[PDB]
Structure formats: structure tokens, C-alpha cells
């Protein structure tokens, strides 16, 4: 559901002694992992995680792997600099993360660009929607912000986000089309559970759907109304979700669940079937 997107989620975790950090880069197309690099692998290289990525030849994988080697060193030096900004103990455990990517518009051009960092799981510095200014989240990030405003680092990222990011996302959508167009509709059912004297829980299940985007609703006599669980992976590439309501005993037939999902020609409507 929504605009096509590409994202790269990168992490470096410092390790003890003279050991270099562990660096992991994960790429996503339309919220599904499609490439991965892990410095802990026997032979570290970017690998195709979506099988349609095997349409890319050896030069692609070499180029991306060389880039990951560069990112790993950028993260290593950046972690060392952060240690000094926060006056922290060296040889310790620390995490640096980056998110970057693009959403596409109806003209196949950039709709929104993303470029942000976190240290110890907290916002550090982020490129604003204008792709020109920076949001420094705390006082140490002011050091980076001044350095990057003076060096013009935003211009480099703006060029990547408006150019390469958009162009490669379009290429991947074309190559992955046969897979990316295949949707799995949710299979839904309502279960009935003892709750109290006079009350029953009705739980509306949506199982085995792809993509993850879904809406579950409950209505009483056609009017909107509820416990929801976070959408969760089934383990086979599809997802699950449920929504439950507490209902008076004898009024179960007055409630309807509606499931909205892009794989469905029309939303599903169902009720408790004794």
C-alpha cells in the first residue's frame, strides 16, 4: 500500500579490544528485504535476499560490496568520533545506525527523501524534508551539524536521494515485478471466547496476507467501534493480525468484522458463526 519505496537500514556495533565493529546493511524495496551485507560473514559481500535480484550481474555485486567496505570504515571513524563527543569509555559496546531512502511520486520522481542517524538507539542527526537543512537532536549532534553545514554534506545526500535512489528503485521494481505484483489475500475467521458473566470476546483473525498493510474493524449494527495486536510475521513471508471486542452474551450476531487488504477485490465482512 502507498508509494513505492526503497530503504537502506545500516548498523555498526562496536566490539571489545582491537576488534573492528560489526557492520550490517539491509536494503528494502516496498518494505520487503531484497539485499543484505554482514561484515561477520565468512566472505562479506552484498547478497541477493529477494531471488529476483539474481537478475543483477557480477559487476553490480562487486560495486555494492566495495561501497559497503567504504560504509564500514565511515561507521568505524564516526563511532570513534562519537565516543569523544559524549566523553565515553573506549573498548565498550556502542551502536550507530542510519536510515536512508526514497519514496516515489506519480511522475517516477522523488516524493520524499530520508537520511537520518541514531546513536545508542536515539535520534542524533537527520536531514530535513527540504534536503537542505539538518535537525540535530541533542548537544553532541551540534558538533556534527556545524561540520556538515560548513562542508555542504546535505548537497551530496540530496543528489543521491533525487538521482540514484529513484533510478535504482525504478530498476528494481521492473526486475522484481512478477513477485512484487503477487498479493496474498487474508483468510479471515471469528472466534468466540468466555470473558465474564454476561460477556464474550469475539476475535477477528486475518491470516496469511501479503503485503503487511491491513485494516481490521468491528462494527455494531453497522456503526464503527477494541484490542488490536501488532501485525506479526507468520514465518512463511505472510503476516497475521487480529482485532477483538467484548460483547454482551446473546448479541454476538449484531457485530461484524471487516477486513481491508489490497489483495481483495472487495473488503471482507464476517461474523461469529455458531
Amino acid at each position: 500500500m502507498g508509494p513505492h519505496s526503497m530503504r537502506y537500514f545500516e548498523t555498526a556495533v562496536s566490539r571489545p579490544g582491537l576488534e573492528e565493529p560489526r557492520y550490517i546493511s539491509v536494503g528494502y524495496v516496498d518494505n520487503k528485504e531484497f539485499v543484505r551485507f554482514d561484515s561477520d560473514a565468512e566472505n562479506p559481500r552484498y547478497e541477493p535476499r529477494a531471488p529476483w535480484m539474481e537478475q543483477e550481474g557480477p559487476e553490480y555485486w562487486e560495486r555494492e560490496t566495495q561501497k559497503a567496505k567504504g560504509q564500514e570504515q565511515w561507521f568505524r571513524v564516526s563511532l570513534r568520533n562519537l565516543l569523544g563527543y559524549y566523553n565515553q569509555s573506549a573498548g565498550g559496546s556502542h551502536t550507530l545506525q542510519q536510515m536512508s531512502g526514497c519514496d516515489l511520486g506519480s511522475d517516477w520522481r522523488l516524493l520524499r527523501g530520508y537520511l537520518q542517524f541514531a546513536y545508542e538507539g536515539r535520534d542524533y542527526i537527520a536531514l530535513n524534508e527540504d534536503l537542505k537543512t539538518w535537525t540535530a537532536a541533542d548537544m553532541a549532534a551540534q558538533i556534527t551539524r556545524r561540520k556538515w553545514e560548513q562542508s555542504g554534506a546535505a548537497e551530496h545526500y540530496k543528489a543521491y536521494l533525487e538521482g540514484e535512489c529513484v533510478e535504482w528503485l525504478h530498476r528494481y521494481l521492473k526486475n522484481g515485478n512478477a513477485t512484487l505484483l503477487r498479493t496474498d489475500s487474508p483468510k479471515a475467521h471469528v472466534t468466540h471466547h468466555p470473558r465474564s458473566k454476561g460477556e464474550v470476546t469475539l476475535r477477528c483473525w486475518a491470516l496469511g496476507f501479503y503485503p503487511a498493510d491491513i485494516t481490521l474493524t468491528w462494527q455494531l449494527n453497522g456503526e464503527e467501534l477494541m484490542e488490536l495486536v501488532e501485525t506479526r510475521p507468520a514465518g512463511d513471508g505472510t503476516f497475521q493480525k487480529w482485532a477483538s471486542v467484548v460483547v454482551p452474551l446473546g448479541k454476538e450476531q449484531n457485530y461484524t468484522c471487516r477486513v481491508y487488504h489490497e489483495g481483495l477485490p472487495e473488503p471482507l465482512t464476517l461474523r461469529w458463526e455458531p
Binding site: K67, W74, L96, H156
Partner: peptide, 11 residues
């Protein structure tokens, strides 16, 4: 194709 931070400053 991921970003290349290397062409620009470290934190």
C-alpha cells in the same frame, strides 16, 4: 543501490 557516505564528512 545504497548511499555512499564516504564522499562526505564523518560524524
Amino acid at each position: 543501490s545504497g548511499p555512499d557516505n564516504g564522499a562526505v564528512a564523518v560524524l
